[PDB]
Amino acid sequence: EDAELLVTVRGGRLRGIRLKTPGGPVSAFLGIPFAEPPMGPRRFLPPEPKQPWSGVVDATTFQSVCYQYVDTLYPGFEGTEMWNPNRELSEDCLYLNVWTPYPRPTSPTPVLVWIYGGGFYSGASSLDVYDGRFLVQAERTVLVSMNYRVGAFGFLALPGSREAPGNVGLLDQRLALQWVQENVAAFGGDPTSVTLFGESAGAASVGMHLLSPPSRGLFHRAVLQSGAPNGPWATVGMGEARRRATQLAHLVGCPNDTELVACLRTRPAQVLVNHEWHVLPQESVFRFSFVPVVDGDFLSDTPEALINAGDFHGLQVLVGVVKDEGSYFLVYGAPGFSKDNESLISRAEFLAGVRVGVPQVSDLAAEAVVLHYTDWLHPEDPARLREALSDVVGDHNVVCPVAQLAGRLAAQGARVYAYVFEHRASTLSWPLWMGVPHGYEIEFIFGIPLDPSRNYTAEEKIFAQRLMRYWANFARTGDPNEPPQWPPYTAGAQQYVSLDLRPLEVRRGLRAQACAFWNRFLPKLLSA
Amino acid sequence: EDAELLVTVRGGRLRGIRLKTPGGPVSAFLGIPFAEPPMGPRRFLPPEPKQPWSGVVDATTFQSVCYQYVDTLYPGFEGTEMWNPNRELSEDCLYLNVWTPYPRPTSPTPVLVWIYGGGFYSGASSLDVYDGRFLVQAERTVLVSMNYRVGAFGFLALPGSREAPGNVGLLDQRLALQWVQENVAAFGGDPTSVTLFGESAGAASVGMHLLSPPSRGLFHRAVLQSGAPNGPWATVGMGEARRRATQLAHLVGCPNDTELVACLRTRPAQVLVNHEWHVLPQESVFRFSFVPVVDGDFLSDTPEALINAGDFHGLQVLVGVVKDEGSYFLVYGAPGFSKDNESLISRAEFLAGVRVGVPQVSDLAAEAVVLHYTDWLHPEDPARLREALSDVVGDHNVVCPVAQLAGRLAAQGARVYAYVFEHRASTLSWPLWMGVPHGYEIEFIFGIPLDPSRNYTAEEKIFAQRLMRYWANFARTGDPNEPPQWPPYTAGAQQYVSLDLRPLEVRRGLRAQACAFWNRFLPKLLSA
């Protein structure tokens, strides 16, 4: 009985497992229960803490994936399959993982907490690209990840009601963050040095914890990759949340909030999932049915207001985006797009696509978009049109929300570092025209190129090791540098770095001209 | 006596004068009356044809300038004085001038008809810079220019009234064009080949004669320099024309339309001039009080409408702009600007300047202007902001109105040639930051550099000779080219040439991006 694989936490005793990495062994505690299974009558309710247990819980493999739609756009393709669940679906899914050095460290060690993305409708901590064994081995940190409910089960809200309050997925995350504060020390973690980091909806989740005081006490630093809580897809208002919930209920046969939620609780999980995408009000891309709701509780105002009003002195933040944020959403709905051709669209398709990528704005707003992103010397060139639609979708949903957050937090007391990830992985299976798509820096942060079974180049393994060092240096010290430098981002100089095989290169302005349009002008237009 | 300088026209007999140029003599007939003096009860009325006279009218000197405001901005400064009246002011000012080769052509010669600019409030055919003698000698054409009433005398309108119908200054121009049809052959001109050409308000005048059918039979091709009839300053609606005429009356002591115009006719001309600028509704630059009115008569609809609806097959047009259209206007009321320092304005000055240069748009529209003309990587750099504000005023008032006119005329059957004039005159007295300002190409078009009394370089005289050749080629054949090439402007390729000391260089797009904003997007914003 290895005692480096035996830990007791407040609930009971845990048996873990030691994993092999190229560089040595790692202790892994996979599938620790942190909540009572949110099933039956607990479907849609806030998570209740895991009641204590006798004996030893075997924490030796990932537990189930929370119920979620499974992508079938290109069945069998690696590019879509790598994000689909790799454990059975179940509503019993509230488990977290801890990776730690072998042997368990003696000094308290800074802790990285990972929150997966997936548009709040999908994702799991068990995906291969989120394997924490390489970061832990390479940088002597403690790594935690948790599952949280998604789709209807985590974010359906009948706001005001007690049976479907909404935001329960975020409360799953918050409960895991409390587990880390009362139990990470048993693994050698330091509960006073905790860095949240996430990507896409994970990055938006990280942001909502910054802006939610009950969560703000549970961590000290933040990394937001390719996402932000002020993005147009990350939240929904109380009214539109209730409309979507009510339409979901009508669609699956349900009729008073109590009666309605009680009826939903009797539907097979798979039945809800099968109608998830039907409650969306407009034909769209980068829009998800059940996302966090702004109801005055978890978020006391909208993220845009809270960001603008916040005092962030004492916070360090690391934020960034990939080079082609938008391309990957287009093959999911934009007319004329396929992974299987060059997707050289017509001007008529471009205009149709702008309505899909910028859904539910006015006809005037749509015109202002076409103005800014047309080239009026080459208004019909299909290459220019395909890259402009890609930039509309990426700027509107990721780059400009992220840029607004970074600028505000710098101006209001936080230290901010910013990056653009510019390396297209050699093993990438999406077509060349998509550039560096959404989500494909994650494997490099987690060190997956160091996997022997993975066929990466030796330079990519060097690059992976650079990025883990930046991330672990940030988690340890609040600054990705160690004694070319990486300058802080500020609202004036707007400095960021490029991450690729070349050494760090400083640049200025995260698509500044474009983002003036989305963050300054377009709001004013919608207000009149 | 010289039989070459005696001419009989329908009204009677004229005695001209022989004029020296470096290249040989030239016959000039200056101060030919073509209307009954629009005085006393004829003030504000359309011009009557000149009743015949006995004896010989003296046509050897220029005649009176029509009453107009005199610029006092930089008293005694050459840059402002070259445009001020250089003959007495009088309401008895409806005269025109003919320059013709010496001895007079005995076969029919193409005719150029110059309509001078000046905001419809000022101008005169006798300015030194409009001296016909050099074009006539170099390119052997007949040149006519006329005086037309300006300010309230030409364009005060009480729409629907018979006492102040509006647009009589335009009728003055039409009458002179008719005089040319019936009389130009007595000087050797060919009334079947008449080219109109104008600059600034003169170009807008030329464009209004294109869009008005009674004028359209009186000339065959048109040149538009730095002006267009669809510019936001060139026309006014009936409502605002009446408001401006009514407020003028109040400001000079006057009280029914008949009773109002009767009191305005009892006032000395100088009294009307003195209150001219005070009927403007907002603090502004590039905005004039009494301009052509859209009343259904001379303009059956707005010039923007008549353009979009026109069949322009059979029309050749030469249109163009100077390189820094807007800069000159800024020293007449943009905060921070003077000809005597660098005018390095602050952000707050720039934002103030934008409301002055884009007057009477909504706050939302002004915001959109500031979006598109701010460098968000350098939002406070004073040299950048000085350029930006110059470009705002130039694009809003001249470049983009002209680009619209060109693109529609081309796409609706007209053969269009477009130029940018990029030479700064060595003799230019305005500061260097103004670049090539509004109006400072005219002196090259008229061949003034050939005057040895002036300090122009050798290369400038050659440049002047190229320009006079282009213009006169266009006059003779509707094509500026000599038989590098000057390609026609099309709505697709948007090709134009740069005119300076270098050989022609073809370029694409008259500020195509900026003009999509002013010409496509901004109308949609103002109608919602």
Ligand SMILES: *[C@@H]1O[C@H](CO[C@@H]2O[C@@H](C)[C@@H](O)[C@@H](O)[C@@H]2O)[C@@H](O[C@@H]2O[C@H](CO)[C@@H](O)[C@H](O)[C@H]2NC(C)=O)[C@H](O)[C@H]1NC(C)=O
């Ligand atoms: C690029 O492909 C899209 C998508 O078409 C699908 O994928 C192709 C590889 C091929 O297998 C098609 O048969 C598939 O339907 C093309 O857009 C489609 O065009 C078809 C007409 O053939 C039309 O019926 C669909 O509605 C279109 N789909 C979308 C999403 O707009 C597009 O024309 C291709 N571009 C090229 C070839 O340049």
Ligand SMILES: *[C@@H]1O[C@H](CO[C@@H]2O[C@@H](C)[C@@H](O)[C@@H](O)[C@@H]2O)[C@@H](O[C@@H]2O[C@H](CO)[C@@H](O)[C@H](O)[C@H]2NC(C)=O)[C@H](O)[C@H]1NC(C)=O
């Ligand atoms: C550039 O000059 C303007 C205009 O000021 C006038 O011209 C100057 C040459 C000098 O003679 C001034 O005294 C004149 O009034 C400056 O803007 C003015 O600034 C003064 C304050 O000194 C202010 O009272 C006026 O309102 C301003 N006028 C306008 C039209 O805004 C401007 O500051 C100068 N720019 C520099 C020095 O960089």
Ligand SMILES: COc1cc2c(cc1OC)C(=O)[C@H](CC1(F)CCN(Cc3cccc(F)c3)CC1)C2
């Ligand atoms: C089933 O009908 C739809 C499905 C989707 C959309 C729209 C639909 O109807 C409009 C979308 O727009 C979604 C597109 C993606 F979001 C889905 C998967 N991701 C992969 C990824 C990348 C980074 C991090 C991740 F966790 C996952 C790429 C685009 C799916």
Ligand SMILES: COc1cc2c(cc1OC)C(=O)[C@H](CC1(F)CCN(Cc3cccc(F)c3)CC1)C2
């Ligand atoms: C008197 O109060 C004003 C006077 C002017 C403005 C605004 C005012 O306050 C509302 C202007 O905007 C005008 C500025 C100019 F238009 C006038 C002088 N010209 C010279 C020129 C150039 C080319 C052809 C010409 F015929 C004349 C350039 C600028 C005067």
